[PDB]
Amino acid sequence: KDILCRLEHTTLRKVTANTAIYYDPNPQSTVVAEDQEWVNVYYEMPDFDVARISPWLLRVELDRKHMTDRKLTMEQIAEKINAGFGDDLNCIFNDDNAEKLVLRIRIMNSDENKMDDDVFLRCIESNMLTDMTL
Amino acid sequence: VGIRFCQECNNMLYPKEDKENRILLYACRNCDYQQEADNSCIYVNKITHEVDELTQIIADVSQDPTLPRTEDHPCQKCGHKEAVFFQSHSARAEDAMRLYYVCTAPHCGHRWTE
Amino acid sequence: GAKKSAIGQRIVATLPYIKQEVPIIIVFRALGFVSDRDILEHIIYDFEDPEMMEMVKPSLDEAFVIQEQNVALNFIGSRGAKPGVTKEKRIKYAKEVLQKEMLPHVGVSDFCETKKAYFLGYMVHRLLLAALGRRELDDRDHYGNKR
Amino acid sequence: GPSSQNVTEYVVRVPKNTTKKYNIMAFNAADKVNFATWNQARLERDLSNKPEDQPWLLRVNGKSGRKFKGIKKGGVTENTSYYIFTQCPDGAFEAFPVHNWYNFTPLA
Amino acid sequence: PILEFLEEWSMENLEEISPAAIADATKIFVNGCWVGIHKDPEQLMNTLRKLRRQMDIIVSEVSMIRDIREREIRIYTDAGRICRPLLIVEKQKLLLKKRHIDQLKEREYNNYSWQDLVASGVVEYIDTLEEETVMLAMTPDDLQEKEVAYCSTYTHCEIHPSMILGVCASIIPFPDHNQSPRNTYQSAMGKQAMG
Amino acid sequence: AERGELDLTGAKQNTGVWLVKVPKYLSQQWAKASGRGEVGKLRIAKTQGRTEVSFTLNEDLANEHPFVLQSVGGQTLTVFTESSSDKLSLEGIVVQRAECRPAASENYMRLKRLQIEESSKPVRLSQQLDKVVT
Amino acid sequence: FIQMSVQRIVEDAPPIDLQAPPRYLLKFEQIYLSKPTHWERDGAPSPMMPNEARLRNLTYSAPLYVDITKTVIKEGEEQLQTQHQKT
Ligand SMILES: [Zn+2]
Ligand SMILES: [Zn+2]
Known part of the structure; x- marks a missing residue:
């Protein structure tokens, strides 16, 4: 089964439960109360993103059963996103203890510091769901 | 999730942030109309x-x-x-x-x- | 594509005596329903459901450029099988096409625009239901569907 | 009081001919049509076709106010008729046939 | 006549309704044209069925279909629709009675005929679309008799199942005992048989 | 004050009017004379929490019509008149809609069949001649 | 077909308008159909039995006639309407 998992094809679309593009202008005060519990953990000592953050946010919730079936934990997904998009995107993911697997995404700090700050998120989310390979 | 229509021309309202105040405004197009977006969530699937x-x-x-x-x-x-x-x-x-x-x-x- | 997969999937219409397809919202505009609310009133009969509302967003975005009935009629005429020498003639030709060539069974008189718009919205509604999986796709081999 | 059991019955009158024809003006609910701001209005036959067999154009409060377009109901009432009951000092209802039906939609 | 009757009854024309009302109401289509909407689809269908079975304002071949899930009522009158006669079943009982059978037995010298059955509303023609919504009983003596309740809402009953066969397949004796391609082969051969 | 001006005095007074859908037999009975100034009597009986509307056909005209009300909140309706003097005016706003239904159920279908035959009279059918034309 | 469609097709056929000044209008009103007939070489019509048609290689056909009204407007303020019965 390990070889079968390593051979078959799995896309963020397969391991993602849902996606939502929130505004969330202030990361410290997240629009999502559930997020605010653990997002503040990362934003208490933020690194590589204190300079600037794009106002928009892309929240993706991942299916626990699919994640366990493909042996895909919360780490390598963010690592793959980082490798694919360079520093273009900042990814902050919750812990497996939480019943909901959440991965907030924002655009790079430099661009914030041309297409669209909003529609570009729809572009990346759909390409991540289909084109990207986990 | 909600869809908002312009009160002036009854056209679709698209989301746009205002950098001056950093708040979401559902702004009309071909109309020069704006509204304050209370819900915040603009897209969810x-x-x-x-x-x-x-x-x-x-x-x-x-x-x-x-x-x-x-x-x-x-x-x-x-x-x-x-x-x-x-x-x-x-x-x-x-x-x-x-x-x-x-x-x-x-x-x-x-x-x-x- | 970046924007291709961002907007989603859009609805077009292959009208008769028109070489290439046109966006459905453009057909509605030509029929004379300009406001997105008016068009969506004829397409979606229950605004409470957001799932069907999200389905029509790409079509509205694609047809956003055209906002006037005459503009939509000229757009259709420009793609009519017999291009009009002038814009007024193109409009006169597109109006004739939408009056007698599209949905003739609904009506061919001059004042059948509302009926044709309602029936076209019903067609779009059936397509949206099929896409959403709320209705089973029609079976070609079914005989109640044969004469 | 008398309101809980009031019974009202009125005569019905149908004059053979009326100087002013009666039509129906229908506005969509979502349009939120309000007559308080209707200080002035202009209803006239359209000029796009360039008369009795053409749609109607309404311009409320001149160019500043909203513009609506009315289209005759294509479906004829070959088996139906519409009548309007209006209060009058004599206390008898008066019924007038609907010559035409028009659905007006605002123009941005 | 169908459109006139629908207008007479509480069917709101499309032009004279706000779109918001279309949600709850059931659409009314005639020959593929969306004539209007109605609020009491069950009562409308009952009235239409009664009219068709009485041959008053609806002819026999007109087919009325109520898609309950889709909230639609499609009335079809155009030609080319294939339909067959079926006995009407109400309250798990045939409307065909011994009086009808006796009048048919005396078919001649009394003017009684099949048209009289159709007018009496004991047997009505069903097309494929309406047959989707019909609850057929293969035979009355077995399927709608008081027994293990497989189904207690039978709407029609087959006159005789063998009527599913064609002219050439109807001359095969005991065709239900033959392997089907042999029935097809005999259907082919009967057209080449001498006589 | 101009030719195209609409007299909105009816709207200002908020005059309420009732719209009714009535059958052709009733309308034609009214049209028969149409000049006697009388066609019937509309009787409305109200109870503690229920109101019924009915119309009685004139005895002379005949030689019961219950009314069923309809909600008018889904669409706003107004009545306007085009005077022969080219002075458009507004009569009032529709506040209630009603439908008139026949009382007879089966025997009424007989009159409906007679109407259908009358309407089919103009329909022309191919005629079987006997004796070739010469 | 014979009873409804032929007559309806003839009725629905638009009136023929001609002008090139006087103008002529042709309208087809009514359909008439006689029994199947066969014309001998001498020109005498006679009813054609189906067995006779089968034996003589004839076509079992019925003559078709239309009532045609021709109205001519000469621009002289008088229009002449002449009806040709069973053309
Ligand atoms: Zn607007
Ligand atoms: Zn219960």
């Missing part, structure tokens, strides 16, 4: 989409003569013994064998699942 089929079920199906009728599942709302049970038979379910029950008593369109 559920891939799993565990939609409650009871919402799709229509109480009028109790009048269908071709649907099976069982008296072993009385209606909770009114206690009526007779009820009509059927499968979803709706695509995207990818597992459709459970039975949805609808009360056969007129004026009581109660629907449930076991």
Whole structure:
């Protein structure tokens, strides 16, 4: 089964439960109360993103059963996103203890510091769901 | 999720942030109109989409003569013994064998699942 | 594509005597329903459901450029099988096409625009239901569907 | 009081001919049409076709206010008729046939 | 006549309705044209069925279909629709009675005929679309008799199942005992048989 | 004050009017004379929490019509008149809608059949001649 | 077909308008159909039995006639309407 998992094809679309593009202008005060519990953990000592953050946010919730079936934990997904998009995107993911697997995404700090700050998120989310390979 | 229409020309309102105040405004196009976006969530899609089929079920199906009728599942709302049970038979379910029950008593369109 | 998969999937219409398809919202605009609310009133009969509302967003975005009935009629005429020498003639030709060539069974008189718009919205509604999986796709081999 | 059991019955009158024809003006609910701001209005036959067989154009409060377009109901009432009951000092209802039906939609 | 009757009854024309009302109401289509909407689809269908079975304002071949789930009522009158006669079943009982059978037995010298059955509303023509919504009983003596309740809402009963066969397949004796391609082969051969 | 001006005095007074859908037999009975100034009497009986509307056909005209009300909240309706003097005016706003239904159920279908035959009279059919033209 | 469609097709056929000044209008009103007939070489019509048609290789056909009204407007303020019965 390990070889079968390593051979078959799995896309963020397969391991993602849902996606939502929130505004969330202030990361410290997240629009999502559930997020605010653990997002503040990362934003208490933020690194590589204190300079600037794009106002928009892309929240993706991942299916626990699919994640366990493909042996895909919360780490390598963010690592793959980082490798694919360079520093273009900042990814902050919750812990497996939480019943909901959440991965907030924002655009790079430099661009914030041309297409669209909003529609570009729809572009990346759909390409991540289909084109990207986990 | 909500869709807002311009009050001036009744056109679709698209989301735009205002850098001056850093708040979401549903701004009209070809109209030069703006509104304050209270909901905040502009887009959301559920891939799993565990939609409650009871919402799709229509109480009028109790009048269908071709649907099976069982008296072993009385209606909770009114206690009526007779009820009509059927499968979803709706695509995207990818597992459709459970039975949805609808009360056969007129004026009581109660629907449930076991 | 970046924007291709961002907007989603859009609805077009292959009208008769028109070489290439046109966006459905453009057809509605030509029929004379300009406001997105008016068009969506004829397409979606229950605004409470957001799932069907999201389905029509790409079509509205694609047809956003055209906002006037005459503009939509000229757009259709420019793609008519017999291009009009002038814009007024193109409009006169597109109006004739939408009056007698599209949905003739609904009506061919001059004042059948509302009926045709309602029926076209019903067609779009059926397409949206099929896409959403709320209705089973029609079976070609079914005989009630044969004469 | 008398309101809980009031019974009202009125005569019905149908004059053979009326100087002013009666039509129906229908506005969509979502448009939120309000007559308080209707200080002035202009209803006239359209000029796009360039008369009795053409749609109607309404311009409320001149160019500043909203513009609506009315189209005759294509479906004829070969088996139906519409009548309007209006209060009058004599206390008898008066019925007038609907010559035409018009659905007006605002123009941005 | 169908459109006139629908207008007479509480069917709101499309032009004279706000779109918001379309949600709850059931659409009314005639020959593929969306004529209007109605609020009491069950009562409308009952009235239409009664009219068709009485041959008053609806002819026999007109087919009325109520898609309850889709909230639609499609009335079809155009030609080319294939339909067959079926006995009407109400309250698990045939409307065909011994009086009808006796009048048919005396078919001649009394003017009684099949048209009289159709007018009496004991047997009505069903097309494929309406047959989707019909609850057929193969035979009255077995399927709608008081027994293990497989179904107690039968709407029609087959006159005789053998009527599913064609002219050439109807001359095969005991065709239900033959492997089907042999029935097909005999259907082919009967057209080449001498006589 | 101009030719195209609409007299909104009816709207200002908020005059309420009732719209009714009535059958052709009733309308034609009214049209028969149409000049006697009388066609019937509309009787409305109200109870503690229920109101019924009915119309009685004139005895002379005949030689019961219950009324069913309809909600008008889904669409706003107004009545306007085009005077022969080219002075458009508004009569009032529709506040209630009603439908008139026949009392007879079966025997009424006989009159409906007679109407259908009358309407079919103009329909022309191919005629079987006997004796070739010469 | 014979009873409804032929007559309806003739009725629905638009009136023929001609002008090139006087103008002529042709309208087809009514359809008439006689029994199947066969014309001998001498020109005498006679009813054609189906067996006779089968034996003589004839076509079992019925003559078709239309009532045609021709109205001519000469621009002289008088229009002349002449009806040709069973053309
Ligand atoms: Zn606007
Ligand atoms: Zn119940």
